[PDB]
Design a protein around this nucleic acid. Structure first.
Ligand SMILES: [Mg+2]
Ligand SMILES: [Mg+2]
Ligand SMILES: [Mg+2]
Ligand SMILES: [Mg+2]
Ligand SMILES: [Mg+2]
Ligand SMILES: [Mg+2]
Ligand SMILES: [Mg+2]
Ligand SMILES: [Mg+2]
Ligand SMILES: [Mg+2]
Ligand SMILES: [Mg+2]
Ligand SMILES: [Mg+2]
Ligand SMILES: [Mg+2]
Ligand SMILES: [Mg+2]
Ligand SMILES: [Mg+2]
Ligand SMILES: [Mg+2]
Ligand SMILES: [Mg+2]
Ligand SMILES: [Mg+2]
Ligand SMILES: [Mg+2]
Lengths: 53, 268, 142, 158
RNA sequence: AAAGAAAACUGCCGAUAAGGUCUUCAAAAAAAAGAAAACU
RNA sequence: UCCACACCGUAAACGAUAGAUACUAGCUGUCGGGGCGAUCCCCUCGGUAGUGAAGUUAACACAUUAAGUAUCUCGCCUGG
RNA sequence: AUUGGGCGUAAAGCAAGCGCAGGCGGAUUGAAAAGUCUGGUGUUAAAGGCAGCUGCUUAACAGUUGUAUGCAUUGGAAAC
């Protein structure tokens, strides 16, 4: 019952695969985080003029 | 359709011969040939080529993508000059002398040390007449020491992303540092090694000054092709691979000298 | 036609015999083991392979039809770590454990399995709850 | 280390060695660092002064941070963590009981994120070994998805 | 004309009033990212 | 202290480790039976040792002759 | 320490053996059904127990309905 001799004689197989190249997505998520910093400094500048008349 | 080394050449270079059966790790049964009816331990040639191709494949993506590979061979004299030869051919960091404790895990202190080496070297290159004779000779000797023990590590500024080990047994410190820091390490196991420590095992010899040289150049050849300079032994025919056996009975691989292991001094 | 080389002997307790064999094989990373075959061991092993902790179990007989031994293998993954985590026997010889249906145990908040042979041979705890019938409790396997 | 990671002292012993005249005294601290969302580590350090001991302990705790998974805020299945002669029993709890832990386990449970948890210290009362036992119990936990991938069933369905 | 070694050695030698510091404590420690602004 | 016949029944009577049963890497010795046929050495089945990983221990350490994974039975322990 | 502990170095393996009664006990088949599980009926006094409600200015409290545990008998299940 169930016999199938799959054969998995690939033990202690390699865990690492590529040369940390997947980091391409880590560079895109860091670029998207820098664009959200430039717009926050424009809107803080517009609010200083309503409290001076 | 990709090719590689030749099967006749592996048999003739003695890369399918391990060490004496008395000295063997029970965890290496997968690669060993029908040793059940055999004298000295050996390996399978098909498994050898597959493992070699995998290690070759892995090192090439790293070297093409601008990784930093470190070679550490501080064993037989031949191996030091062997490791030196790859350094001349490719601008890879090397550790030919003794592996300092914490070369990787405590990289900060060794980074400070190599920075001191570089700073002292450049001041001396700039020169001055104040150096005179006595202090200059003393200063030259410290400089000599930091190249002999850090001459191949000065180039790199960050932890390497891969290690190539000649003997996992002899470099137990190096492989332990690689394992704890989760860095790939490849090694040439010789029937007496724990497979957990190494990542890409490449069943081969380690006592023959011919098998060792052939395999080390093959890995260097992957790096050299990735770096875009012509290869030396990989993807090459018969006429150009022939190599000689170093001098200093006959080149072999039997492990003896057992009489130098008596009982630990005891009694009362 | 499967051949062997070693003589096969076994301990007397058929539930913990398998349990000792399974636990030792798990700890030693061994794959192929052999033991003497009994109908209780065959049936409990059958539900075990249905519940998914072991892969295959083949029972064979002698050419004389006087002896049977069951030789099972474990289901190791690619990285060579087993699926079984721990086995412990309750109804040891001497002290037999009898629990009614309402007091049928739940192993590891239902993740593990409790093996219960009530009246229609061995049966897993979940299907035993479905039938609302209880009985002998052999061992906890998770 | 850049997280909600809170720091707290779980024990401050006073160790000393003997030299050729006098006793070299150093303070030892056992700090438990946790972000209260699934990241928690522990660090024990010794130094000539309490601030430096604390400094070394906090540095060590952030270097060794383990990952923690929660099910409904609690532990999925009952587990006994063993470390030396210290045995700590963890048991799933219904939402509302609160943290019924005390001492090193209570500090660990709060810093890990877990809410409802039943605990009992069945062994010794040395804080490091209960935490060792506590960490062993929490790290040995099996998710109901790893067993699914192993035994090949459907996510959580029976 | 190398296989050697080489050797212990002993006399005698007892005791030390009581209770006693010393680790106080880590809570952990003050300040950069700002701007600045038109006005009829 | 020795001998013969009668008692005494205690020892650090120690492997400081009750007996039986099943499973769990290996290496180096040595002993016995058996197989081959120069010894020597190779294999099998057992007894006695050393080294040694998983495993166990508070640590020392044990580690296929377990103090490991388990079952049966007996004896014993509960601060000084 | 049945659930829920130990006996190498901390308390604890009798000096060892032959051992009845006791405890435990190979595989397969048949029957019975003592264990084991389950259905029906009877009973397990009332107060107390837990849940809900009412009444006392709410409570404490009182009342109210619900709420098991075991035994016996009968009818089945046959894995141990
Ligand atoms: Mg002095
Ligand atoms: Mg005199
Ligand atoms: Mg005196
Ligand atoms: Mg006196
Ligand atoms: Mg304080
Ligand atoms: Mg006595
Ligand atoms: Mg004696
Ligand atoms: Mg030993
Ligand atoms: Mg007393
Ligand atoms: Mg006790
Ligand atoms: Mg004692
Ligand atoms: Mg005894
Ligand atoms: Mg005794
Ligand atoms: Mg007897
Ligand atoms: Mg009897
Ligand atoms: Mg039977
Ligand atoms: Mg009543
Ligand atoms: Mg009342």
């Amino acid at each position: 019952m169930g016999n199938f001799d799959s054969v998995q004689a690939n033990p202690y197989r390699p865990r690492f695969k590529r040369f940390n190249a997947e980091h391409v997505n880590q560079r895109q998520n860091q670029q998207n985080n820098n664009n959200n910093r430039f717009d926050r400094n424009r809107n803080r500048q517009h609010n200083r003029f309503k409290d001076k008349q | 359709k990709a090719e590689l080394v030749s099967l006749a050449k592996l048999g003739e270079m003695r890369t399918h011969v391990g060490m004496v059966k008395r000295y063997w790790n029970p965890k290496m049964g997968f690669f060993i040939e029908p040793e059940r009816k055999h004298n000295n331990d050996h390996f399978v040639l098909e498994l050898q080529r597959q493992s070699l191709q995998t290690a070759y494949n892995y090192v090439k993506e790293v070297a093409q993508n601008n990784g930093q590979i470190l070679f550490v061979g501080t064993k037989n004299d031949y191996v030091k000059k062997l490791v030196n030869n790859i350094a001349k051919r490719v601008d890879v960091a090397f550790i030919t002398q003794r592996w300092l404790g914490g070369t990787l895990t405590n990289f900060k202190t060794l980074s400070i040390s190599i920075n001191k080496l570089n700073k002292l070297v450049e001041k001396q290159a700039e020169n001055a007449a104040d150096l005179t004779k006595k202090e200059n000779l003393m200063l030259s000797r410290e400089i000599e020491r930091l190249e002999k023990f850090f001459g191949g590590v000065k180039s790199l500024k960050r932890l390497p992303n891969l290690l190539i080990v000649d003997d996992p047994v002899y470099e137990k410190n190096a492989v332990a540092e690689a394992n704890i820091l989760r860095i790939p390490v490849v090694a040439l196991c010789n029937t007496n090694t724990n497979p957990e420590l190494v990542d890409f095992i490449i069943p081969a010899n380690n006592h023959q000054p011919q098998s060792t040289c052939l395999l080390m150049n093959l890995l260097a050849d992957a790096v050299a092709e990735a770096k875009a300079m012509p290869t030396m032994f990989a993807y090459k025919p018969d006429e150009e691979i022939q190599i000689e056996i170093p001098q200093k009975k006959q080149i072999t691989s039997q492990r003896l000298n057992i009489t130098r292991n008596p009982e630990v001094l005891t009694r009362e | 036609m499967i051949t062997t080389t070693k003589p096969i002997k076994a301990h007397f307790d058929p539930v913990a015999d398998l349990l000792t064999k399974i636990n030792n094989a798990r700890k030693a990373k061994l794959m192929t083991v052999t033991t003497i075959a009994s109908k209780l061991k065959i049936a409990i092993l059958e539900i075990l392979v249905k519940e998914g902790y072991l892969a295959n179990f083949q029972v064979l007989e002698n050419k004389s039809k006087t002896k049977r031994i069951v030789t099972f293998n474990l289901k190791y993954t690619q990285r060579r770590i087993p699926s079984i985590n721990g086995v412990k026997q309750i109804s040891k010889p001497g002290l037999r454990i009898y629990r009614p249906f309402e007091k049928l145990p739940l192993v590891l908040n239902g993740l593990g399995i409790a093996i219960i042979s009530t009246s229609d041979g061995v049966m897993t705890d979940k299907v035993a709850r479905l039938k609302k019938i209880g009985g002998e409790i052999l061992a906890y396997v998770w | 280390f850049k997280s909600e990671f809170e720091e707290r002292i779980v024990k401050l012993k006073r160790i000393s060695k003997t030299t050729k005249g006098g006793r070299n005294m150093r303070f030892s601290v056992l700090v438990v660092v946790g972000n209260r969302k699934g990241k928690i580590g522990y660090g024990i350090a010794k130094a000539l002064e309490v601030p430096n001991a604390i400094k070394k302990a906090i540095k060590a705790a952030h270097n060794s941070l383990h990952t923690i998974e929660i099910h409904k805020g609690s532990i999925y299945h009952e587990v006994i963590g063993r470390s030396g002669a210290s045995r700590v029993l963890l048991k799933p709890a219904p939402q509302g009981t609160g943290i019924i832990a005390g001492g090193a386990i209570r500090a660990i449970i709060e810093l890990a994120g877990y809410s409802d948890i039943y605990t009992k210290n069945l062994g010794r009362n040395t804080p490091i070994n209960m935490i060792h036992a506590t960490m062993d119990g929490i790290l040995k936990q099996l998710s109901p998805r790893r067993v699914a991938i192993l035994r090949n069933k459907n996510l959580n369905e029976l």
